[PDB]
Each structure stands twice: as C-alpha cells, then as structure tokens.
C-alpha cells in the first residue's frame, strides 16, 4: 500500500532562465533524499524512523554515473527541456468573463446578495472590486475564494456583496485580470 515519488522540480523565471533544481526520492509520504549541487551528491533528509533507509537510497543513487551526471547537468537541461514551449506557457492567456446576478443571502440580513461570476480565465491571478454608483465599496462580507482550478487550464471564482435595493442604485463588479489590461465590468440595478 506504499507509494514512492521520484520528484524533480525545475524552477525558472520568465524568458527561460533556470533558477533552481532538485531531485528527491520519497517513500510513503515521508521524504528521503535530495540532490545537493553544492556537495555534488545526493544527500539524505528526514531522519525519521526511516533514517536508516535514507542513507541507503542515496548511496545507491550516488553510485550511478548516469544519474549523478544527469543531475549535475540539470539546470542546462531545464532550459532546453522547457524552451520549445516556455514562451507559449508564460505568455498564454484566456480573458475572464463576468456576469452579475443575485443569489439567496449567505451571511447577513440585507435583503439582496449580489454574486459576481468571473470565469474562464488563465492564469489564476485576478482582482475583483465592487462599485455602488461609480463609487468603490470597501470589504464587509465581500468574501470570494482563491480562483478554483478547472483542470481545463482555466479558472473561475465568485465575489459576493450584500446590499439594500434603492432604485437609481447601480452596482458594478470590476475585474482586472493579469491577462488583460482592459478591466471587465458587469452592472446590476434594482
């Protein structure tokens, strides 16, 4: 019933510059060993009940010309490996869509609860702000979430705002997505 991971994370900034690199073996959810480019070898970690196992794992991995030389080179691979598509990824965006509607009251007594539906965007970074008659409205029950992933390589989230209907009032949800300079808006009147 056990599980093992041979994880290798590659961190890079925009353009395509490698910034960090690791290789780590981990049995069960406990972590065993990670490479250390300083020492040049695969060094153990989590000296738990499995401290013993840790030493071994690394030794074995250490006595492998290929692996060590694979790791050593690492960062240089990271570039080539990612390069062909890195531009696409770092610069691929899907603009969000917004729709405002009213929904059954969550927390609070106000007779109307507005819900701003922002969906279909990438990356996940986005900011929602509300406006009452062109006026910014500070947060009080303005509870959102943290952009839910769809796995569809898109994201969505929702913003709530409680209020009292007075004709002539216009509410607008403003959304600025890091993938579009054009802030999106959706208004709602009683």
């Amino acid at each position: 019933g056990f599980v093992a991971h041979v994880e290798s994370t590659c961190v890079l900034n925009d353009a395509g510059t490698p910034q960090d690199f690791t290789y780590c073996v981990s049995f069960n959810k406990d972590l065993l060993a990670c490479w250390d480019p300083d020492v040049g070898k695969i060094v153990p970690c989590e000296f738990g009940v499995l401290s013993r196992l840790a030493e071994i794992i690394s030794n074995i991995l250490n006595e492998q010309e290929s692996l060590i030389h694979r790791l050593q080179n690492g960062l240089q691979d990271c570039a080539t490996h990612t390069q062909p598509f890195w531009d696409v990824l770092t610069h691929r965006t899907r603009a969000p869509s917004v729709r405002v509607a009213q929904t059954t009251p969550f927390n609070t007594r106000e007779p109307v609860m507005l819900a701003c539906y922002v969906w279909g965007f990438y990356p996940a970074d986005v900011t929602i702000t509300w406006m009452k008659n062109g006026q910014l409205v500070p947060s009080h029950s303005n509870k959102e979430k943290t952009a839910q992933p769809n796995g569809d390589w898109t994201y969505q989230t929702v913003s709530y705002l409680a209020l009292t209907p007075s004709y002539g009032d216009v509410y607008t949800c403003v959304v600025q997505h890091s993938g579009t300079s054009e802030p999106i808006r959706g208004d709602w009147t009683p």
């Binding site: 019933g1 056990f2 599980v3 093992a4 991971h5 041979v6 994880e7 290798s8 994370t9 590659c10 961190v11 890079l12 900034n13 925009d14 910034q19 073996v25 981990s26 049995f27 069960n28 959810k29 406990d30 972590l31 009940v49 499995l50 196992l53 794992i57 074995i60 991995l61 492998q64 290929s66 692996l67 694979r70 691979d77 490996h81 990612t82 062909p84 598509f85 696409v88 990824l89 770092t90 691929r92 869509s97 729709r99 509607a101 929904t103 059954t104 539906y117 969906w119 279909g120 990438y122 990356p123 996940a124 839910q148 992933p149 769809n150 796995g151 569809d152 390589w153 898109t154 969505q156």
Partner: protein, 181 residues
Amino acid sequence: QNHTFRHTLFCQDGIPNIGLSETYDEDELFSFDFSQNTRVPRLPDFAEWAQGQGDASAIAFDKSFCEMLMREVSPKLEGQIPVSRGLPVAEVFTLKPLEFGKPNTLVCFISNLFPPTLTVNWQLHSAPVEGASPTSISAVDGLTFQAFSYLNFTPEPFDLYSCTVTHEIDRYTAIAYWVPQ
C-alpha cells in the same frame, strides 16, 4: 516572475501502479503513457512538445528505481509502520455559470487524494449515467494528488447530480452532490 515545472514520477501498488505527471504552476501539461511509452497532452495545444524531448533514458532509470523500492523496501516494512492515507474530498460545480436549458459541464473536483487510486461514478437521482470523461489524476505540490471528472449536461430545475469517489477499491467512498444553485 517565477514559475514551477514539476516532473513527478510515482509508483505504488494498485489502480495505476505507475505514473508520471508534468505540470507548470500546478496545471498539468501532460502525463505519460507507459504502454505506448509516450507523453499525453492535457490539451491539443500542447501535443507538439510532448512529441520530442527524448529524455527517455531518465524516465527509464527513474521508473526502475521506483519499482525497485516497491519491490524491496515495501515488503520489508509492510505492516511494520503506518500508511499515509489521505481522506479524499469531492466538490461539484459548473464550468460556466448556470443558465437553464443551455449546455453546460459539471466538474467533479477531488482533492487530498492519497494514494492516487480511485474510481469516479456520476448519478442523477441515484440513476447512474455515463458520457463522463476519463478521470485524470495529477500530481500536486507537497507529494499529493488531485483528480477531475467532467460531465457535459443541460441543467434543469429538478436535477440532482452526485459524484461518487471510491477510494482504494472498496475502502472509503465520498459523495458530492450538486443541485441547481
């Protein structure tokens, strides 16, 4: 600023006894089919890149080392120390906001999945239903997994969809319900 490309390879006993998942900022780029011995794009947009790379020699070694630990290490301590189990959580929601009669897609989002072994079934008032897409497990930061299962459908006022996750064959199920708003 920064971005994270993760190449997680894992092995276990059961369901997919071996898998590879390569992500970027947590969204899966492509997994890897060990039968045809090739990468599989999460989106057609990708395809071309899953094509090349020829890093096969690493995968080969990683794979072996993994299977190796499952072979030797496991038996040694099977029943000697505790299994990290993660009680899975399922949530259900729509891709686009709700518009009765207009086409939509339900999403069953599974989180805290550990180990990555499961089966997802959708129902509608207990009435089972198919047309669901394959459930894709993906590795996630912190040595864990998450999976999604999509099901297109046309939302109607008296609907009641349920997404049933069945963890580790027969030990622990999770049922998430979705009703119209």
